[PDB]
Amino acid sequence: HWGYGKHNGPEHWHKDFPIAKGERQSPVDIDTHTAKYDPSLKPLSVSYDQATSLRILNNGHAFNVEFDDSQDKAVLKGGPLDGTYRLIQFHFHWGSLDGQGSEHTVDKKKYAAELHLVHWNTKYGDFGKAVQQPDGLAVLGIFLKVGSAKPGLQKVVDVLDSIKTKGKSADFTNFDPRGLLPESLDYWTYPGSLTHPPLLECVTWIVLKEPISVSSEQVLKFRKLNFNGEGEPEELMVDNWRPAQPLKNRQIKASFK
């Protein structure tokens, strides 16, 4: 099945998922000098006060922190978006070392990791329907650099030992994703895709300019996870990022100058 290795990684995905070579694939490199400042872009509205996290899952590729999305409790609106998008899950992508891990790049700079908060457009009723539409998802992407610890990340870090291997999950209630945000909501935006199979071209990407800082110890705990299942040969969960894809006929817009 697909993964991140030599034998099943991003350069292979197009065989089972031909949309891998499509017209609006993600991630991309953000060329800061080419991105157009767009004064029509509104401030992002991130409303996570009523977010209900439920569970954390090691899915064999990353770990997902899952939310109750049965009502409008944690939503993303404004920015480049029309309508209301409900938070379903967040996850990360990270590297074997601090010099790689992010999926988007900024003037070819790779960050140590990238957080994706995934939200679906409520006008399509459920996530499975939303991913079939070109405006079905909004993914908020946040870079991670290594330096000072992120206090609001530590609860995530300290549950990882309980979900070491693929298919393990744990209760993860009352987690506040506001603690993962940077100070500024300045962003870049462009139309793209899911960055892992099925690679569906359903995402409005919103990538924050300001990275969050996490500690080396925090990221090291991400790197102790396993791609494999319980008792199987240990394969550390590292380098679970897709590289930058061709921009093709797309414009990256900035909310700031």
| Residues in contact with Zn ion by the rule CB under 5 A | 116
Q: How, if at all, do strands 137-146 and 212-214 pair?
A: parallel
Taking the complex as a whole, the smallest distance from the CB of residue 142 to Zn ion amounts, in Å, to: 11
Give dist(CA 177, CA 152) in Å, integer.
Answer: 8
Task: Give the residue with the Cβ less far from Zn ion, 79 or 101.
Answer: 101
Evaluate the omega torsion of the peptide bond into residue 198 and state whether it is cis, within 30 degrees of 0.
yes
Q: Which two three-digit tokens encode residue 243?
A: 């590289």
Taking the complex as a whole, the smallest distance from the CB of residue 195 to Zn ion amounts, in Å, to: 5
CA angle, 193 then 172 then 218, to 5°: 75
61 is catalytic: yes
Q: How, if at all, do strands 75-78 and 44-47 pair?
A: antiparallel
Backbone phi and psi for residue 129, each to the nearest 5 degrees, phi listed first:
-75, -40
Residue nearest Zn ion (C-beta atom): 116
Task: Give the residue with the Cβ less far from Zn ion, 55 or 256.
Answer: 55
Residue linked to tokens 């009502």 = 71
Task: Give the residue with the Cβ less far from Zn ion, 86 or 116.
Answer: 116
Taking the complex as a whole, the smallest distance from the CB of residue 257 to Zn ion amounts, in Å, to: 28
Task: Give the residue with the Cβ less far from Zn ion, 75 or 142.
Answer: 142
Taking the complex as a whole, the smallest distance from the CB of residue 23 to Zn ion amounts, in Å, to: 20
Q: Which of 12, 61, 91, 93 is catalytic?
A: 61
Question: 166, 58 in Cβ contact below 8 A?
Answer: yes
DSSP H or E stretch at residue 221: helix 216-222
Give the catalytic positions in this structure: 61
